[PDB]
Each structure stands twice: as C-alpha cells, then as structure tokens.
Design an enzyme around this catalytic site. Structure first.
Site, PDB file in Angstrom:
ATOM      1  N   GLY A   1       0.815  -1.226   0.000  1.00  0.00           N
ATOM      2  CA  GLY A   1       0.000   0.000   0.000  1.00  0.00           C
ATOM      3  C   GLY A   1       0.847   1.273   0.000  1.00  0.00           C
ATOM      4  O   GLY A   1       2.080   1.209   0.108  1.00  0.00           O
TER       5      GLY A   1
ATOM      6  N   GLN B   1       5.899   4.263   0.129  1.00  0.00           N
ATOM      7  CA  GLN B   1       6.622   5.525   0.391  1.00  0.00           C
ATOM      8  C   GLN B   1       7.689   5.350   1.494  1.00  0.00           C
ATOM      9  O   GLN B   1       8.831   5.825   1.339  1.00  0.00           O
ATOM     10  CB  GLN B   1       5.650   6.695   0.663  1.00  0.00           C
ATOM     11  CG  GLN B   1       4.844   7.004  -0.594  1.00  0.00           C
ATOM     12  CD  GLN B   1       3.917   8.214  -0.623  1.00  0.00           C
ATOM     13  OE1 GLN B   1       3.569   8.693  -1.711  1.00  0.00           O
ATOM     14  NE2 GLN B   1       3.445   8.714   0.528  1.00  0.00           N
TER      15      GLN B   1
ATOM     16  N   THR C   1      -5.649  -1.308   1.601  1.00  0.00           N
ATOM     17  CA  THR C   1      -4.606  -2.241   1.145  1.00  0.00           C
ATOM     18  C   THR C   1      -3.659  -2.571   2.319  1.00  0.00           C
ATOM     19  O   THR C   1      -3.459  -3.732   2.624  1.00  0.00           O
ATOM     20  CB  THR C   1      -3.889  -1.709  -0.089  1.00  0.00           C
ATOM     21  OG1 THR C   1      -4.845  -1.414  -1.126  1.00  0.00           O
ATOM     22  CG2 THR C   1      -2.805  -2.652  -0.584  1.00  0.00           C
TER      23      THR C   1
ATOM     24  N   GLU D   1     -10.438   4.235   9.646  1.00  0.00           N
ATOM     25  CA  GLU D   1      -9.111   3.719   9.990  1.00  0.00           C
ATOM     26  C   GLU D   1      -9.114   2.911  11.310  1.00  0.00           C
ATOM     27  O   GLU D   1      -8.523   1.839  11.302  1.00  0.00           O
ATOM     28  CB  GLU D   1      -8.027   4.826   9.971  1.00  0.00           C
ATOM     29  CG  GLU D   1      -7.914   5.476   8.608  1.00  0.00           C
ATOM     30  CD  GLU D   1      -6.668   6.322   8.429  1.00  0.00           C
ATOM     31  OE1 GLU D   1      -5.694   6.102   9.175  1.00  0.00           O
ATOM     32  OE2 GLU D   1      -6.661   7.201   7.540  1.00  0.00           O
TER      33      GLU D   1
ATOM     34  N   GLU E   1      16.602 -13.579  16.868  1.00  0.00           N
ATOM     35  CA  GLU E   1      17.112 -12.914  18.072  1.00  0.00           C
ATOM     36  C   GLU E   1      16.261 -11.723  18.483  1.00  0.00           C
ATOM     37  O   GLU E   1      16.163 -11.439  19.682  1.00  0.00           O
ATOM     38  CB  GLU E   1      18.604 -12.553  17.943  1.00  0.00           C
ATOM     39  CG  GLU E   1      19.307 -12.506  19.290  1.00  0.00           C
ATOM     40  CD  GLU E   1      20.641 -11.789  19.294  1.00  0.00           C
ATOM     41  OE1 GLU E   1      21.370 -11.901  18.280  1.00  0.00           O
ATOM     42  OE2 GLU E   1      20.939 -11.077  20.284  1.00  0.00           O
TER      43      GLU E   1
HETATM   44  N1  LIG Z   1       3.978   7.916   7.910  1.00  0.00           N
HETATM   45  C1  LIG Z   1       3.239   7.781   6.809  1.00  0.00           C
HETATM   46  N2  LIG Z   1       1.935   7.517   6.914  1.00  0.00           N
HETATM   47  C2  LIG Z   1       1.322   7.405   5.710  1.00  0.00           C
HETATM   48  C3  LIG Z   1       1.873   7.563   4.458  1.00  0.00           C
HETATM   49  N3  LIG Z   1       0.908   7.407   3.475  1.00  0.00           N
HETATM   50  C4  LIG Z   1      -0.198   7.154   4.141  1.00  0.00           C
HETATM   51  N4  LIG Z   1      -0.008   7.133   5.504  1.00  0.00           N
HETATM   52  C5  LIG Z   1      -1.004   6.768   6.536  1.00  0.00           C
HETATM   53  O1  LIG Z   1      -1.608   5.537   6.163  1.00  0.00           O
HETATM   54  C6  LIG Z   1      -3.040   5.585   6.374  1.00  0.00           C
HETATM   55  C7  LIG Z   1      -3.790   5.408   5.063  1.00  0.00           C
HETATM   56  O2  LIG Z   1      -3.346   4.196   4.421  1.00  0.00           O
HETATM   57  P1  LIG Z   1      -2.609   4.159   2.994  1.00  0.00           P
HETATM   58  O3  LIG Z   1      -1.368   3.374   3.142  1.00  0.00           O
HETATM   59  O4  LIG Z   1      -2.554   5.481   2.324  1.00  0.00           O
HETATM   60  O5  LIG Z   1      -3.704   3.288   2.215  1.00  0.00           O
HETATM   61  P2  LIG Z   1      -3.476   1.982   1.318  1.00  0.00           P
HETATM   62  O6  LIG Z   1      -2.764   0.966   2.117  1.00  0.00           O
HETATM   63  O7  LIG Z   1      -2.909   2.379   0.014  1.00  0.00           O
HETATM   64  O8  LIG Z   1      -4.976   1.508   1.071  1.00  0.00           O
HETATM   65  P3  LIG Z   1      -6.157   1.978   0.108  1.00  0.00           P
HETATM   66  O9  LIG Z   1      -5.695   3.273  -0.519  1.00  0.00           O
HETATM   67  O10 LIG Z   1      -7.377   2.111   1.003  1.00  0.00           O
HETATM   68  O11 LIG Z   1      -6.256   0.845  -0.892  1.00  0.00           O
HETATM   69  C8  LIG Z   1      -3.306   6.911   7.082  1.00  0.00           C
HETATM   70  O12 LIG Z   1      -3.287   6.755   8.486  1.00  0.00           O
HETATM   71  C9  LIG Z   1      -2.148   7.788   6.604  1.00  0.00           C
HETATM   72  O13 LIG Z   1      -1.851   8.876   7.468  1.00  0.00           O
HETATM   73  C10 LIG Z   1       3.286   7.814   4.369  1.00  0.00           C
HETATM   74  O14 LIG Z   1       3.952   7.907   3.343  1.00  0.00           O
HETATM   75  N5  LIG Z   1       3.887   7.912   5.610  1.00  0.00           N
END
Ligand SMILES: Nc1nc2c(ncn2[C@@H]2O[C@H](COP(=O)(O)OP(=O)(O)OP(=O)(O)O)[C@@H](O)[C@H]2O)c(=O)[nH]1
Ligand SMILES: Nc1nc2c(ncn2[C@@H]2O[C@H](COP(=O)(O)OP(=O)(O)OP(=O)(O)O)[C@@H](O)[C@H]2O)c(=O)[nH]1
Ligand SMILES: COc1ccc(/N=N/c2cc(OC)c(OC)c(OC)c2)cc1O
Ligand SMILES: [Ca+2]
Ligand SMILES: [Mg+2]
Ligand SMILES: [Mg+2]
EC number: 3.6.5.-
Lengths: 426, 436, 155
Positions: free
Chosen positions: B10, B15, B145, B183, B254
C-alpha cells in the site's frame, strides 16, 4: 478508478448539466471546439475523469443527453459549448411527459430506455477503469424524475459494482407552483433511497431564498438559480478533477461520508455567495457553515453533522485552514456527533474557480436534511389526502399503493435522521 | 549470512520503503544504478549487507524487496524516480483499483485478484536465497490495502513459509494526517487477523512522528516526506544489526528472543535520540550520557504512551557512532538509580547493549543534522497498552451504532468478524494488565 | 342519467355541454361516489367559467364531499386564485373545516400559494384555527421556515 459517465435527463437536468460542462471546461482550459488552451499542466492531469481523448488531441465530454421532449436538444446545441457534445450521444424522444412521473417511468420513458442504455454501454466499454455515474435531473417534473430514476435502476442492474451519484434538484412552489411536483418528488425519493450511493440535494427553495434575501434579486430567473448550482457542482467535483495529495474518487467519498446506507443525501454549501455579472480563511470557514450559504433549505444548527467534507480553493496557508477548521469544531461542537471520531475532512486545491481568488465548498451529511424531506412530505400528504389529480398517474398503469409506499418510505427516512440526531456516545 | 526479504504494502508501506532503500544505499555505499565499488567480490558474496541485497554477474546490487499496491500511482513514482534502476521491474506489482480505505476490499474482493501473482514473485526472490530467515513487512494500519491485503498476505506466508520469521513495521493512525474515518475499524481488523502470523511488530504512531517533526525539527506543518525521512532513520537503526557485523539482534530469531517474552505481546516501543534540525549545523555534540537519558523521555518515543505508568519486560540499547563502551556502562548505572525504571519481577533487570562504531548517515535533502553519536532503544513495556486502548475506544464509539459496517458486509465480510476482532483486542489489553 | 354526464363535463371543461345538460334537467348538485359535485370538480380542474355558470344555477357553494372538502378547500389547495375570489363573492365559508381539521388557509399555506393566503386573510380567515394536530397556518410557516409566509400571516 478513473472515468465518470455523466448523464443529464429532462429540462432541468440538461440546463444544469450544460452549465456544468461550460464551467469545468473553462477551469480545464478547454474551448467550445474541444481544444486545450490552458497554461497549467495541472489542468490536464486528471482530464480523462470527465473527458474522452479524441483524434487531433480533441477533448469530448463523456456526457449522454436524454429527454422525452425534442426541443431540449436544440437549446443544448445553441449554447456556447453546444457543439462540444458527441452528436451520437443525444437520445431524444418525440412526446414529452408533461410533469407526469408515471409517463417518464412506465410508458413514454420506458420506450426510450433501451436506446439510452445502448449509448451508456458504448461509453462504458471505452473506459480504462470506470468509477461510476453522475446524473443531473430535477425531481419535480416527469422525464428527469420518472425516466431518470428508471435509468438509475437499469444502470444499477447492469453495473452493480459501480458508484451511482446524482445532483438532484428539489421542487419549491417559490420557483414552480405546479401542485403535482410533491407527487413526482416523493415517488423519486423512494427510488433514490434504494438505488443511489450518494445524492447532492440541490433545493430550489434555498436557491430562491439566496437570490432574493441575500443577493437582492427581487425577480430571480433560472439563469440566476443555475449560477449557484454551477458553482456548487464545480466545487464538489474539484477533488475528482485536480490532483491534490488525496487521490479522491466516488467510492472513497461514499465510504467516508455515508455511515448508514439510506442516509446518503448531502447538503452542499458554498462561499462566497455572488450574483452574475457582479475574503480571508476565518471568514470563509464561518460562511461555509452558515445556514444562509446552504444549497438545501435546512438550518444545520437544528441537527447534527454525521460527516463533513470541505474543499478550500485558491492560494492560502494550509496551517491556517487546519487551525480554523479545528476552531469551528470547538465552538460549534454540539452540532457534530461525538460517536464518529474525526468526522470532518479538509482538502486544499491550488486552482480556484472563475472570478474568485478564494472559495470554500462544503459537503455535509447532516440530520437537519430531514427539514427538506418533511416540507415535501407535508405537501404530498395535503394533495394525496384529497386524491387530487391521482387519475393522471393510475391511468398510466400505476397502482395507488405505490403512492402509499413512497410516502411511507420518506417518513421512515425522516425518523432515521431523527434517531441519529438524538443518539448519544455515552 | 541469511537473507531477509522486505515486503512493502500500500501507499504508506511503499513511500516508507522508498525512503528506507535510499538510506540503505547511502549507508552501504551503493549507487542508484546498483553499482558498489567497495565490494571486492563481484557477482556474489557472503557479507552482512548481502542479507538485504543480492548481486548479479554485472556487479549490480539489487534489493531483496517486493512493492505491492492495489492501484499504480504510488509505485509508478518508484518506477520513474532516482532509484528506478535499483529494483527489478517484476518486484514492483500494481493492480488497477484500490481497496477504497476498506479492509474487506483489500482482503476479500479486490485483494484476491492479485494475491497469487504476489506470492509467485516472492517465491522467485526466495528461490535465490541460500538460507532465507524471513520477512520484513511494511504497511499502514489505516489503508484498505495496508490493512486487508497485508493480512491475506501474512496468512498465505504462514502456510507457504511456516518456519520463517515475520516482522512488521506498522503505521498507526493519527487524526492530524489521516485519510479515512474508518481507519480504527481497519486497524482492529488487521491486528486481530495478523496477530498469530507475526512474530514481532514495531508500530510507528504518526502523531508521535508529527510531534517530533514540529518540536525538534521546527517544521510548521509536516508532510509525509518529512515524516518518512525520520521514520527511515529509525527503521535503519532497527535493521542495522541485520546488515552489518555486530553482537546484538544479529538475526530475525534474536529480535524475538530479546524483545518478545510471550507470543501475543510482541509490540516493542522504539525511542530515538538525538533528533536535531539541519539548520543547526554547528550544534554542540551530546554525550553518551545525554542521549541515553533522552531515551527515557516520552517525547522521543515512536508511539505516544507513558512508560512510567508501565513495567519493562526487555530493554535493548543500539548505539551508532563515537561511543565508548565504559561510557555506556556509566550512563546505565546512573539511569538505574531511578524509580521510573521498573522491570517485571520475572525478567532480569538487565539492559542489552550493541554498538556500531560508524556514525549515522543522513540523506541529502533531509531535515536532520549530522551527529557523531545516536542511540535507538527498543523496549517491551506494558505502557504500549495505552496505544491499544485509544484505538479500541475509537472503534467502540462507531461500532455501538454499527456506523459504516454495511461497507464491509457488502465486500464479503460477516458482521461477526467485527466482534471477534474486538474480543481479541479486549483479551490483548487483559494480557498487558496480567503482566502488570 | 344527466347528473353523471354533468359531473364529467364540469371536470373536462366542456362549457357548452354544461349549458345543454342543465337546460335538459341535469342535477346541478349531483354527487359522485365520494360526494364531489360538478362545482367541486370545476374548482379543482380550474374551469372558471363553469364555476360561475354553476353558481348562477343553484349549485351549493358550501357543499361538502365525504371528507368534508368544500369547493373553496379544493380551489385553495390547487392554487386557482380567480376561482377562490368567485367562491368568496358567492358566499363560500372562508373558515370551513374538513375531516383533517384544515381550513382553506391551512391548504393555501402548505402549498405556498401566497396570493391566495392574502386573499383569505382579507376575507376573514381565522389565524387561530388549529388542525387535528393543533397546528395553525402560522405554526406551519414557523415549522417549515417559510419567512415569506410568516411575514404575510403577521400582517
Ligand atoms: N507515515 C506515513 N503515513 C502514511 C503515508 N501514506 C499514508 N499514511 C497513513 O496511512 C493511512 C492510510 O493508508 P494508505 O497506506 O494510504 O492506504 P493503502 O494501504 O494504500 O490503502 P487503500 O488506498 O485504502 O487501498 C493513514 O493513516 C495515513 O496517514 C506515508 O507515506 N507515511
Ligand atoms: N434550478 C433549476 N430548476 C429547474 C430548471 N428547469 C426546471 N427546473 C425545475 O424542475 C422541475 C420541473 O422539471 P423539468 O426538469 O422541467 O421536467 P422534465 O424532467 O423535463 O419532465 P417533463 O417536461 O414533465 O416531461 C421544477 O421544480 C422546476 O422548477 C433549471 O434550469 N434550474
Ligand atoms: C469525514 O471523513 C471523510 C470524508 C470524506 C473523505 N474523503 N472523501 C472525499 C472528500 C472530498 O472533499 C475533501 C472530496 O471532494 C468532494 C472527495 O472527492 C471525490 C472525496 C474522507 C474522510 O476521512
Ligand atoms: Ca559481493
Ligand atoms: Mg420538460
Ligand atoms: Mg492506496
């Protein structure tokens, strides 16, 4: 989740629909001939959501234009963006429906329904990944209301896993004093509760009230009312059309805005309110939450916000917007349900609309919307109790039990809003 | 040398993945095209960096990594950015339609269309391993995801790689930078279904990272770019023992032996210090004593909670830089004369120490200043139960009204799964209360 | 039976047919199954000339159907201003109450026919008349947020 198939049905549906294409084409740098004259690469980034790419790099709206009355097609073509529509996407009958929901839904409307579906199929199969549909229509007439809802149910049977979204115009005796409109609207609400995922409630009562009491137009016209509608439709589609950090689509809006399947009627809002041919972040937050800026004639302070989405457009500090949004939730806390944590979401778009340096668009799912439903319900009951003009409907094949059922469903809907307005997080 | 495969799921997982592999390349001296001039063994090797990077006959060092997302816009940035040539293109897998912030779509309906392709591509990576130790899984709790697809993936990895370790780096939601109202639902669903399939999980509270970026880095409104850069520094400190020579946490097994006394309470807290803004290039250098003390300040924690309110079951101190072992001993001895360090009576009150004598690397374009010494403390404290209660309360407010539940039920999930997932979280909160 | 034909002629707006049927002995006060008379049907369907013709030929301006509706209740509900004025000129009870407790004022208010509301007020309509749920026309304007109607009722 990319393409949207837009359908516009009946007179109100086609007039508000045409204004939408004209306004969003201007924002995207598109001219009436279909050519791109824009200066920002951010105007073509998500252009395929509403436009098909054609030979010569021409941009054709993914719009289908439908009406039982033929004259409507002539008014669409004579507009500024009239020739931009696909000549094959116009499905127009010969005999209108004369404000008769039964004509639109059962007899004249049902004859022209397989023809519209052929055009829907063609545009849908040419899509990389269809998001869903967008319908513009009025609920007070016969074609947009009766045939519009029939089209919705038919599309829902063929494409069940796609989102159905409508911009539904509610009647008001202040704009049109045609006593059969509460019948038509109540019959259509009964269909909208079951067959759409999200509906933007655009009330002619609120539109008239804004033009008359706030904008000082003592004799408002359709042009005047449609100026508020086009700004609202532009604002609520901003995030489907411009990149942004969020990758917003119709399904993500549904999951996050709609906690109970039937409560999918949104109260949109806009700031600043302005008239045809005629601001800071704290003021814009205030105005966006004021009852006088709502597009549905309901006082939000009479109910509670289940969920809110707000779009600030133009150049401004995102920290200032975050600050003011949290501030409006503090002093006006008793107007938000405490059992849905973090129920207010904000987006900022760099590209503002035409004529405005800054703007804010509000999309609320508020229990105060029951006021709009009760107003139409009271009118339907006054008429129905005297069985006035009932033969105009039953003569087209309708059963009198469909009226009883529609009234029963709309009153159940009001009770459900009241139920969540009185619920506590204990 | 035992290989480790990283799986990024996801948007958040992807990222965060991008920022970690950039930093790993800088620490090992690997170029963006995969070339590594300090590696004398071309086309193979048994060095410690080989646990995370395989080698081709052309001297190319390739990450042992898989990136998966149900939509392609986040992974497409990896396909076209600075490190586009570093990953094998078949290692980057994308669908067309995402899970729409819905656990049920990621796990049941959309997730099923790509699960076998992902597993077959992971098998290609596993086949090139001589002694695979396991997997590092990166994902958000909140995304459709990150929550649903990750649990389906963890279920299938437990059947196909039964004896291998599974470690997670999970992003815990924050109101300040969240995407969806549901969430909390996604978070409890994925926690319940993954609990038996994960051996150790490091949760990263987005609110803790957001607060550190604001307070220590003077960043007014932190973006994901600022958060991910800080997260990757902390993830690098946690994984350094796997990629370099050393005596502490040298393999996935470990991490379980040192940090996980009981299978269900597998959520260690990470604390990191010092975090100094890059605009303070001439800052005073903090001593081993000062950075060690900083590890016991709630402000520097990766998960918002108060360890003074709980008891410790394990504590590991991972140093990087100019750190003399007798200075660590003296700092620990001073720290032991403190009433806020209470260990459970059934665990030795010891602190395990590991020191890597190379200073941390900072990425060009980052927000952190260079430092001559840093420390990451990994501890298993019952105070992390506070994080679980905050999430369970948010779940309860909505669930009492069954708000949003129809979206899950409409994607092949039974309503009974929500109560079974909540009952498991109630049991997990009681597990922490039973320890102390 | 010329009564059943007169009922049908009044609804359909057949002016010459009404004149013929009355000259041949049709009952001007004939009722359908629900008690509606040719005047009720003419008032509902907006046939102004048939209403005036019927009133010059002994039609009961205050006839009630089985639900207590008078021709004035139906003319106020449907929004026929010219007919409301003709009915009041011919003695219609401005404050007639139907089985639901509604007066013509309650129906003109609900349906938003503000000109008809002003006409009823000028002819003595009772602002304190309550329906079966205790609501007056002023309560209806308050409950629905109809500022235009509230201003008129406050005159
Ligand atoms: N630290 C951090 N949190 C992130 C980032 N991108 C999204 N989030 C967090 O992840 C959550 C949203 O999930 P995402 O990972 O964007 O969603 P996904 O897993 O792609 O799922 P769907 O888009 O629903 O298919 C929220 O709480 C966001 O603040 C990132 O690059 N860094
Ligand atoms: N805001 C707005 N309302 C409109 C417009 N045109 C019509 N309406 C409203 O729509 C309702 C009438 O529906 P129409 O759309 O005209 O009817 P139709 O769907 O074409 O159906 P028929 O002509 O009866 O077959 C009334 O409430 C009108 O006030 C318009 O351009 N703007
Ligand atoms: C109350 O919580 C939520 C509400 C909606 C959320 N996002 N869905 C969208 C929101 C939109 O405006 C910001 C939008 O522009 C209209 C949109 O375009 C399709 C999607 C997410 C939430 O966490
Ligand atoms: Ca080598
Ligand atoms: Mg029409
Ligand atoms: Mg995603």
């Amino acid at each position: 989740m990319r393409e949207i198939v837009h359908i516009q049905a009946g007179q109100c549906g086609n007039q508000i629909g045409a204004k939408f294409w004209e306004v969003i084409s201007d924002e995207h740098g598109i001219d009436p001939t279909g050519s791109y004259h824009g200066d920002s690469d951010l105007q073509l980034e998500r252009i395929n959501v509403y436009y098909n790419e054609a030979t010569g790099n021409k941009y054709v709206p993914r719009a289908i234009l439908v009406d039982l009355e033929p004259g409507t097609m002539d008014s669409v073509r004579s507009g500024p963006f009239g020739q931009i529509f696909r000549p094959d996407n116009f499905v127009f009958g010969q005999s209108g429906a004369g404000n008769n929901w039964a004509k639109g839904h059962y007899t004249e409307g049902a004859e022209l329904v397989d023809s519209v579906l052929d055009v829907v199929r063609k545009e849908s199969e040419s899509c990389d990944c269809l998001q869903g549909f967008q319908l513009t229509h009025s609920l007070g007439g016969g074609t947009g209301s009766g045939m519009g809802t029939l089209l919705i149910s038919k599309i829902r049977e063929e494409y069940p896993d796609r989102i159905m979204n409508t911009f539904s115009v509610m009647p008001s005796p202040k704009v049109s004093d045609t006593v059969v409109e509460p019948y038509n609207a109540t019959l259509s609400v009964h269909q909208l509760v079951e067959n759409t995922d999200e509906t933007y409630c655009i009330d002619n009562e609120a539109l008239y009230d804004i033009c008359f009491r706030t904008l000082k137009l003592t004799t408002p016209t359709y042009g005047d009312l449609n100026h508020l509608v086009s700004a609202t439709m532009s604002g609520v589609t901003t995030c489907l059309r411009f990149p942004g950090q969020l990758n917003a689509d119709l399904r993500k809006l549904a999951v996050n805005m709609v906690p109970f399947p039937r409560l999918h009627f949104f109260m949109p809002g806009f700031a600043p309110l302005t008239s045809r041919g005629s601001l800071t972040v704290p003021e814009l937050t205030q105005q966006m939450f004021d009852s006088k800026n709502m597009m549905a004639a309901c006082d939000p302070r009479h109910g509670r916000y289940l969920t809110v989405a707000a779009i600030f457009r133009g150049r401004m500090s995102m920290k200032e917007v975050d600050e003011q949004m949290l501030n409006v939730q503090n002093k006006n806390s008793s107007y938000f349900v405490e059992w849905i944590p973090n129920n207010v979401k904000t987006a900022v778009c760099d590209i503002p609309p035409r004529g405005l340096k800054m703007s804010a668009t509000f999309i609320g799912n508020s229990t105060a919307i029951q006021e709009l439903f009760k107003r139409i319900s009271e009118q339907f009951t006054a008429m129905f109790r005297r069985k006035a003009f009932l033969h105009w409907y039953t003569g087209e094949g309708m059963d009198e039990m469909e009226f009883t059922e529609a009234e029963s469903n709309m009153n159940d809907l009001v009770s459900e809003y009241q139920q969540y307005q009185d619920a506590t997080a204990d | 040398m035992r290989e480790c495969i990283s799986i990024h799921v996801g948007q958040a997982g992807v990222q965060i993945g991008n920022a970690c592999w950039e930093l790993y390349c800088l620490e090992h001296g690997i170029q963006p095209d995969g070339q590594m001039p300090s590696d004398k063994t071309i086309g193979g090797g048994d060095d410690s960096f080989n646990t995370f990077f395989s080698e081709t006959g052309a001297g190319k060092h390739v990450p042992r990594a898989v990136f998966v997302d149900l939509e392609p816009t986040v992974i497409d940035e990896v396909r076209t950015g600075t490190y586009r040539q570093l990953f094998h293109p078949e290692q980057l897998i994308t669908g067309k339609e995402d899970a729409a912030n819905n656990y049920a779509r990621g796990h049941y309906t959309i997730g099923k269309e790509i699960i076998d392709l992902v597993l077959d591509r992971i098998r290609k990576l596993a086949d090139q391993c001589t002694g695979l130790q396991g997997f590092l899984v990166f994902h958000s709790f909140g995304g459709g995801t990150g929550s649903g697809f990750t649990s389906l993936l963890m279920e299938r990895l437990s059947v196909d790689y039964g004896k291998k370790s599974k470690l997670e780096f999970s992003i815990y939601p924050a109101p300040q930078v969240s995407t969806a109202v549901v969430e909390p639902y996604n978070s409890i669903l994925t926690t319940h279904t993954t609990l038996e399939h994960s051996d150790c999980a490091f949760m990263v509270d987005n609110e803790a990272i957001y607060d550190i970026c604001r307070r220590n880095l003077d960043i007014e409104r932190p973006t994901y770019t600022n958060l991910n850069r800080l997260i990757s520094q902390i993830v690098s400190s946690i994984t350094a023992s796997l990629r370099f020579d050393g005596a502490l946490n040298v393999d996935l097994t470990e991490f379980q032996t040192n940090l996980v006394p009981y299978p269900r309470i597998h959520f260690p807290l990470a604390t990191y210090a010092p975090v100094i803004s890059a605009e303070k290039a001439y800052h005073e250098q903090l001593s081993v004593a000062e950075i060690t003390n900083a590890c016991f300040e709630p402000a520097n924690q990766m998960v918002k909670c108060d360890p003074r309110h709980g008891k410790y079951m394990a504590c590991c101190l991972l140093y990087r830089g100019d750190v003399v072992p007798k200075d660590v001993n003296a700092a620990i001895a001073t720290i032991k004369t403190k009433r806020s360090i209470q260990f459970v009576d059934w665990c030795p009150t010891g602190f395990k120490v590991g020191i890597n004598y190379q200073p941390p690397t900072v990425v060009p374009g980052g927000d952190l200043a260079k430092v001559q010494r840093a420390v990451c403390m990994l501890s298993n404290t019952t105070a992390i139960a506070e994080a679980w209660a905050r999430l369970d309360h948010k779940f309860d407010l909505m669930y009492a009204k069954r708000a949003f539940v129809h979206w899950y039920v409409g994607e092949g999930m039974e309503e009974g799964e929500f109560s079974e997932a909540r009952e498991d979280m109630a049991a997990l909160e009681k597990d922490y209360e039973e320890v102390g | 039976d010329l009564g059943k034909k007169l009922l049908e002629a009044a609804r359909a707006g057949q002016d010459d047919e009404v004149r013929i049927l009355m000259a041949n002995g049709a009952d001007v006060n004939a009722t359908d199954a629900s008690g509606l008379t040719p005047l009720h049907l003419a008032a509902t369907y907006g046939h102004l000339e048939i209403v005036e013709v019927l009133l010059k030929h002994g039609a009961d301006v205050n006839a009630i159907d089985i639900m207590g509706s008078t021709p004035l209740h139906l003319a106020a509900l449907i929004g026929h201003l010219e007919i409301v004025e003709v009915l009041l000129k011919h003695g219609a009870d401005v404050n007639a109450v139907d089985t639901w407790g509604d007066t013509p004022l309650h129906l003109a208010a609900i349906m938003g026919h503000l000109e008809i509301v002003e006409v009823l007020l000028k002819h003595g309509a009772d602002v304190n008349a309550q329906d079966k749920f205790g609501k007056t026309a002023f309560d209806i304007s308050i409950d629905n947020g109809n500022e235009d109607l509230a201003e008129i009722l406050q005159k």
